[PDB]
Design a protein around this ligand. Structure first.
Ligand code: HEM
Ligand code: HEM
Ligand code: HEM
Ligand code: HEM
Lengths: 146, 146, 146, 146
């Protein structure tokens, strides 16, 4: 994989306008709603029986913040996401046995959330940069399976 | 598959507020930009070597209009997408040999387009209804292969 | 989708020569070995931390037998897999929350198992018929999600 | 990604028993038969209108030999497939616009061909090594898209 300098600039610049305290819960909650089978990885998170329960669940919001904060840190290591995600790959793959295909689904949900928060600013070219970003994150997190 | 009455209400309701003519060109254009290999099916449209050339291209816009018009008409037949798309499944599969994965990618870009236009109105539930929709469209379009 | 008379003849004909009891344990066992994350749905079967422990495990063998038996019975209803698998789609989707991608992975392993057992008899055409079959099984099993 | 030494030994040892002059055409022909839309990338190859035409087509056989000879060379660089496939990624991605998902399908077809040629020798553990191998090859060939 390879990020162009324009990919870097776009990822870094859009991410600087993202409010992680909102986006985190919105992204994980949306994943749990839209692709419900992913809820089986979060039985300890309490009520996930309805969309309103999921989007208002305080554990979902707290954990989505963690997710996006790790992504925010990863954006400072665009040219070595594999090394940067190595310990999270061991966690998700050797420990939790998360299906690699779900890392792609979360990427799709993040892209949706960015489209919602930025509207027209999320141009085709910007979406392409971020589609490359979430695909590279999925590849880096599933590395222990590969 | 099966659409719920709530899925139908959401799909019909949001689609009535879509500008098919612009949304179609935006959806096809984004597909070509975000998943570049799809450009190989549209060599006759012209130079598609950049986002600006793709999004400014009149044939992309005119064809996107056809695509979303057809999708719109399918929304009158949500319990029978397979039958309603039978002729277009023969065209895409037996004559154009479009990879079935590409029907899913176009569906994913439409969902991004709807998220951009509708913003916070595209709640997790609404996205779930549309994810189901674009999944069912891709199944109906690839029926000839299955 | 649609099975051809040649698809039906091939599927029924080869399946009559399958040893469901051994093939089922081999198919489930391989799924668990080749796509390790699937082990998380079968924690109650015991230690699945190696291929030898998985392939020697009596519960894997006994459950694989159920899976292929059910598949075998579905082969009596090739024009109506959705209806024939309705109850198992509710079980897998609404209760067990099995990711839809996993139904496709089990289908891919069954095709490998059939290739191992039948060798040159599993010609490209025969594989095509079975690929269609295991694709249609996965669609019917994930119907509750779509 | 990471190959274990056991993965290396298995990949190298099985590959040494493979007859590329047969396997090459059998693998590409099978891909063209089982996933027919891939035939659109080979219009110059002549008759691909039937399974017998495809499996007997001399261009398909000649090109499948090239494919597996490149893979055979790649097996001598297991720990750097990305660098080893860089020029083929530029060819397949920037030039030919092959869908990354097809590189996974060819991997699935190769695994089928190995299962056919080796039968029981293709144990679950050996399949797992080779599933990792064809997945890493798909990732290395699609690198220019990523
Ligand atoms: C692909 C983007 C993802 C990233 C950046 C990410 C990041 C993280 C991080 C930072 C943690 C916390 C580690 C710690 O605090 O030490 C974590 C925990 C976890 N992740 Fe992810 N994750 C991702 C996707 C997923 C997906 C797709 C799933 C499954 C649906 C998943 C399931 C979990 C689970 C079950 C935990 C542990 C939760 C608990 O504490 O019970 N993650 N993830
Ligand atoms: C939402 C799913 C899609 C729908 C509803 C759709 C619909 C249509 C329609 C109505 C036509 C026009 C046929 C006529 O003019 O008579 C068409 C043509 C075509 N479609 Fe699609 N399509 C879809 C997805 C795709 C995908 C994913 C691809 C490939 C990436 C594709 C490639 C093509 C090509 C190559 C043509 C012929 C264009 C030409 O000749 O200029 N379509 N499609
Ligand atoms: C060829 C597709 C499949 C078929 C025909 C199938 C069939 C079945 C059947 C007949 C049962 C038994 C229900 C009963 O005992 O009443 C079952 C249980 C189950 N299936 Fe599947 N299954 C398939 C794919 C999967 C996949 C892909 C997974 C997850 C990777 C899965 C996970 C499970 C689990 C967790 C159970 C419950 C086992 C327990 O309680 O011990 N199945 N399946
Ligand atoms: C993933 C495993 C693959 C490998 C190892 C591979 C390898 C190669 C190699 C070595 C060449 C010849 C380059 C030369 O001689 O200089 C080539 C050509 C090509 N490949 Fe692949 N390939 C792979 C998959 C694919 C797939 C999935 C497709 C599309 C269905 C594809 C389509 C082609 C085409 C169209 C050509 C040019 C053929 C001609 O000369 O017209 N390849 N590939």
């Amino acid at each position: 994989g390879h990020f162009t300098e324009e990919d870097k600039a776009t990822i870094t610049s859009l991410w600087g306008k993202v409010n992680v305290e909102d986006a985190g819960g919105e992204t994980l909650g949306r994943l749990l709603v839209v692709y419900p089978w992913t809820q089986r990885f979060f039985d300890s998170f309490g009520n996930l029986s309805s969309a309103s329960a999921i989007m208002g669940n305080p554990k979902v919001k707290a954990h989505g913040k963690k997710v996006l904060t790790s992504l925010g840190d990863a954006i400072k290591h665009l040219d070595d996401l594999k090394g940067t995600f190595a310990q999270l790959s061991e966690l998700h793959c050797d420990k939790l046995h998360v299906d690699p295909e779900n890392f792609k689904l979360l990427g799709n949900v993040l892209v949706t959330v960015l489209a919602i928060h930025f509207g027209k600013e999320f141009t085709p070219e910007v979406q392409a940069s971020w589609q490359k970003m979430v695909t590279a994150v999925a590849s880096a997190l599933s590395s222990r399976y590969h």
